[PDB]
Design an enzyme around this catalytic site. Structure first.
Site, PDB file in Angstrom:
ATOM      1  CB  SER A  31      -0.822   0.007   1.349  1.00 39.14           C
ATOM      2  OG  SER A  31      -0.507   0.958   1.936  1.00 39.14           O
ATOM      3  CE  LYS A  32       5.409   1.346   3.850  1.00 41.68           C
ATOM      4  NZ  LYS A  32       4.993   0.777   5.259  1.00 41.68           N
TER       5      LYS A  32
END
Lengths: 458, 458, 458, 458
Positions: B41-42
């Protein structure tokens, strides 16, 4: 020109001890008996037993001798037997080295082996196997040197007369190691018969044997000492059965080979120390005849070695020189270079990581030192052992995923790396392991289990 | 036709958990975010940060990104930056795997390694080295994902609107693991601005982190938890900060991948556990939107492995089948056949002999047993340890040449051979070792240090 | 909110290659299909086969799927099946790592293994075991992805339509790696049906496969290549089956992940190289749509490694920097310090001593250099091998008790120790081993075996 | 009562060999010399040398004897010198054993070690170091037993008269091994002066020594042979210099100790062989007086050992019994069970894989066999070496990633498992290795290296 090397058994010389006996005492002559053709002092009884078994009709020409010997009577038995061609079959415990068995075989014998220290009474030890082999084979004659009066008879007919004819009856005492109740009994009988009562028969014995008046032990001076009463030893013949230690025996053996030019074994050292302790109750005008019953060339790995004499509590001093000249900083090599490996666990790494860093490097203690660079000063947070972590992980007092900074023991004491093993051997007398600070920065951990491994090998 | 891989970062699907959440509660939909190009998700934060630093003239064309990245944000930064050709120089602690740095390099970056567990602010930790790099190399830019508003701003612009758009504003809760104060901060800001006050922003956290209300700790679930307060975390956004352990987190990860077909990592399991524990205080008519922030293919050796889990007190049950089915009789092989070596010391041997036979077989305990051949029954005279002898020999209570039958502790308890490791692990909770009896005749000694060794490797 | 992670299978994006395609050619778009929920491009066919076997009345709810897969179709099959709860039983050869099998299990399957490279036709390889397991258990349905038209049907209904609707029929060529036909056949049929004949269907293939028109081989790019004709591949659909090498495939994979931000495996690199070779016959105004069928996270040990790519004849360059920056003087460490051991045998020591020193130091050649001090100059009398002495001792040309100075080969060629491995390889391309002179004094012997063993690990 | 042991040096007995000499020849009496206090007949010269150097004022009271001694004369010198307290500093080459230096030190000397096989006149050999010691340390005296007339003078005064006195001048021949030339020159001058010319002085010598009429050689019989002319040897004294090999010397040593009850060394066996070969050219009425100059208890691991005598072409037969009773099926254990590892490489694996397996299993050759499970019959496709692959991979004839079925040599010949080693040796006299078939199914490969290594250790 003799007819066989077995005729030169006897007439061994009688040398005098010069630099071992303390000044202010009589003369101590040492009947050197390692110059026999068989090397030992027991080939004198082997010939007598062979002759008394041939004449008395028990060893028919063609028989096969069988004796559960250790390796010092076997040589003489094999030599005398193979003179005339008697097949020799021995039985030996595992305690005897490979070299002694190779010697026993080189003389034409057959040496079978049984495990050592096994219960003698069972069919496991060499006594039961020897008895079975004697029963089965035909013509076999087990001399049984322990309950055969021929031993004392030979030491009475050919050892007593020599000690008398060589000194001309002016011998006051006669000290001789008593291993199988042999030499002592026969020589005492003779020197008491043809001298009235002037000769007092002293007898040496390893400290803690039956003869001395003690109980069983594990022995190191091969040949002497016992755990029962042989039926070929008159306990009345001797007069004062001294008891000598093993450290003293080995030290006297070494000092004798160093200062008198005689390579004698352990029993010889024990006998000489017993004599030296007997040369203090009798002032001048006395003559004490020790009996050195063996030659110290098979003991070049046991006593005259420098590791086997420190695998135990022996080695008062090094064989030829300085005391130790060896520092702890050298105990930590094991490769001559292998100490760039300070094995540390910082105060944050999980407990499981510490146990793993122990299991991986085969160590059992380590300083939990922050500042990863192994150049740090005495700023070590503490120490984490292995038996504790594994004790605080199975009892519930700590979980694997925990931080070592809450289950570490206080720092362990330290010593400088440039110091001999003496101060360490004394310092580990209060703790279980200690760090070796080298210029203020720890460089390793020296532990008892390692100190022994080093001493016991180098 | 997209113009670059780094443009597909967003619009990740929103799956509904079915077999995990217990019945009787609202729908627990999990925004599965390992479907981004970068994997996690980063990536969402990387793009936003690069765009902001390229628009406000702080990363001049030709610069060189530099950041002490954990390895997951590194992938996103590398992908987005190399879109345009900005050299990336990451600084990672040694606690990162090898394949992680291989992934970072395969994207065209350069990863310099620094020691871990050292003081965070010292000259050896990666923070100081990253600052040095930023100062020296011209054009450098430390994004500082821990105090950069761009993180929450992006998670507010492109993570909030999606949650409220793919559900038609019918979202009651939003639970998301809070590591840096990212997704939770911005997502809560949004789902509170444009939902009134109904959306209560819950937040998961590993037990023992600053957010939960505890102190420091060593973390295993990579990504979440902290030992300080990131300058990019509004502690007033969350409303009910749940705390979850590590065992439960990993168990939930594995069970989620087994019952929902999602290879999520550790923080994903922690967030799902927090959601499930929130899906009980709010009955039906509710919709809980969890956020799975990572993909579990780099964790295929850590959490889905069966040794790294049982190195710790994790591993409730094996992935494939029966609980253990591994007996102590198997713990004693180490070679699949390596127990024809029952190491014994008869009650007559010397103490030094026993110590040597302990040091030469790599063991630390052994039973003194007569009748050497290891076929004997329970008639073992005793057991001689290794720490005792090295303590009864250095204190002076015993001598190297003394019989072992005078310094031997009583026998050690025994257990069967075909018993599961669970038993043995419980049984060693009172003693430090125990024999393994096969038919009654002991065949070896199992010790804690060996039990943990078998567990942590098989 | 999808109802299961298995509904996100499809609609994969279509990115464009920017820096790989050479200038002066049309556009090359790469259908990136590693963004599927199942990781690879085989989960389309998995879904389609599950649908066909469930609707067509052949997989009754409660059955147990069985497929002798390798580890790429297994993931998709397990995901789609365990959606609704079909027990999955696989069969795998030993050629698959632990990580792939752990992945297959983490999704709720049961993976049984059989030895690899064993004759496929026998009951030994995994094909026979798979057939037996299918026959015995009840409810099992072996999809047989090699002779199941559902593969091409799915790649025809959901892959062809996407490649067309995303580019709007302006796609000239379509290059895709082949290894079962399911992909080239389906998309080829579609792009030929609804576009007339404008679309030419190219197909990549590892150099030396059946499709290319060759014979069998051992393959390294997992997934592509074959040794026979699957019944699910129309050899007429494709138009120009290019043949690509393995070195080229891996190099293109690495360069693609380095310059395009795509972590693709081997087949992806092969397909991209086939396309690049196809972008030279068609000038500008063309559009070639490669199909990247996998994600390069499981190949972080095979290709993106730096040893496995040097274990073979691959590794044209190091992963991120200098060519080798490694000298022969470093090949001779194996411990970072372990070269104070120049192993020599003087011209007078018996041949047996030379053979013994060789057998002891684990070397197979050595310089017979007088002047024992290992500081000598080029004054080495000669060299002695091991295969010669052992060849001149069993044939009668030399006796054990002889002098080595009459059975030694001429000195062996030498190179300086401070030079890279490349020249070492070029040199050993002419001899069997050579000395490493370090300042004029020999310091060791580098041999083919050692150099290869070093390259294959570091 | 002797005043010191060093006075018992002389008057050694004269035994008659009975079972060794073949019938039909004169009596062969062997003057046995290992009955001296210092072990061998090399302490006759030590007494005379010390007396002469103490009478002619060349070794002032307090001096320090220094000599590059071989270890046998060292014992005599140490004993005689330490009679009066002269420090002995011996210089020995590393060729000497450890127990030998232990014997030298146990007598109170100091032994410095120097390298062996180095040029004799260089600064590292013991000659130069001994000369340096003599120059520097005041009071030093290098006896130089090689050019000192005292040797022959003593062997003339106290070794000749005994031969002629214990036989009543009825000695026809006098054979005595000649090395440094001190006993044929001394015991020859006398027996020639006071017997007319009847006593022909024969002389034995190891085949290939200066005296025999050959060139240099590496010697094994410690004591005899030379590579130059000692200044103390009159080559006109001997009349018929016989030459004897080393195998014959050791065989005669063992046979003499087995059939005559004498543990003599190597030179003793050589002298006895020379005498026996002289006891054929002179019929009955003759009396041959051999001279056995050493005792075989230091050689108990060199000539009476069964491995050192098998590490060469020696060891006609074993001491204890049957010839070998050891089969190749035993040569392939190395652990008593270590052949559950038939190392194979199937014809499909890569060449690199075969190389890796050869390198990781410690073997250097292996049969490529289909049907992996090593239960297969003679249906082996071929055999792959490791010198070929490492030569077919560096020359370019093969590629490191190519199938092994294209660079494999034809199968290697096979032999049964329960066959005697001698058969295996004769077989390997033609090839470089061969399989061991058990019931027809191969179980391992026996090679020249492994066979010759098993011989030299068991």
């Amino acid at each position: 020109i003799a007819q066989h090397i077995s005729e030169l058994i006897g007439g061994t010389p009688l040398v005098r001890l010069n630099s071992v006996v303390p000044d202010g005492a009589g003369t101590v002559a040492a009947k050197v008996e390692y110059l026999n053709p068989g090397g030992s002092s027991k080939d004198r009884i082997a010939v007598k037993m062979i002759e008394a078994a041939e004449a008395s009709g028990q060893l028919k020409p063609g028989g096969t001798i069988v004796e559960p010997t250790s390796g010092n009577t076997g040589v003489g038995l094999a030599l005398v037997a193979q003179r005339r061609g008697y097949k020799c079959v021995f039985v030996c415990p595992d305690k005897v080295s490979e070299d002694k068995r190779n010697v026993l075989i080189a003389y034409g014998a057959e040496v079978v082996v049984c495990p050592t220290a096994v219960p003698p009474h069972d069919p496991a030890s060499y006594y039961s196997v020897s008895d079975r082999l004697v029963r089965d084979i035909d013509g076999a004659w087990k001399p049984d040197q322990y309950a055969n009066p021929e031993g004392p008879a030979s030491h009475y007919v050919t050892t007593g007369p020599e000690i008398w004819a060589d000194t001309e009856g002016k011998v006051t005492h006669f000290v001789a190691g008593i291993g199988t109740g042999g030499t002592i009994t026969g020589a005492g009988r003779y020197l008491k018969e043809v001298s009235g009562g002037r000769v007092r028969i002293v007898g040496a014995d390893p400290e803690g044997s039956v003869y001395s008046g003690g109980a069983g032990r594990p022995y190191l001076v091969e040949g002497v000492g016992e755990d029962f009463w042989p039926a070929a030893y008159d306990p009345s013949v001797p007069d004062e059965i001294i008891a000598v230690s093993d450290s003293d025996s080995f030290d006297m053996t070494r000092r004798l080979a160093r200062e008198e030019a005689m390579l004698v074994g352990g029993s010889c050292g024990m006998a000489v120390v017993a004599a030296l302790k007997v040369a203090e109750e009798a002032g001048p005008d006395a003559l004490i005849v020790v009996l050195l019953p063996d030659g110290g060339r098979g003991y070049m790995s046991k006593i005259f070695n420098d590791a086997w004499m420190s695998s135990y509590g022996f080695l008062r001093s090094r064989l030829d020189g300085s005391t130790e000249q060896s520092t702890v900083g050298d105990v930590l090599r094991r490769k001559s270079g292998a100490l760039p490996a300070l094995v540390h666990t910082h105060p944050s790494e999980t407990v499981r990581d510490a146990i793993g860093i122990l299991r991986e490097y085969g160590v059992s203690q380590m300083p939990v030192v922050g500042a990863e660079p192994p150049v740090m000063a005495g700023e070590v947070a503490g120490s984490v052992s292995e038996r504790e972590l594994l004790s605080a992980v199975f009892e519930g007092r700590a979980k694997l995923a925990d931080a070592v900074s809450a289950h570490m023991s206080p720092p362990l004491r330290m010593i400088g790396a440039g110091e001999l093993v003496s101060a360490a051997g004394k310092a580990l007398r209060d703790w279980d392991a200690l760090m070796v600070v080298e210029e203020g920065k720890p460089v390793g951990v020296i532990t008892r289990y390692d100190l022994l491994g080093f001493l016991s090998e180098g």
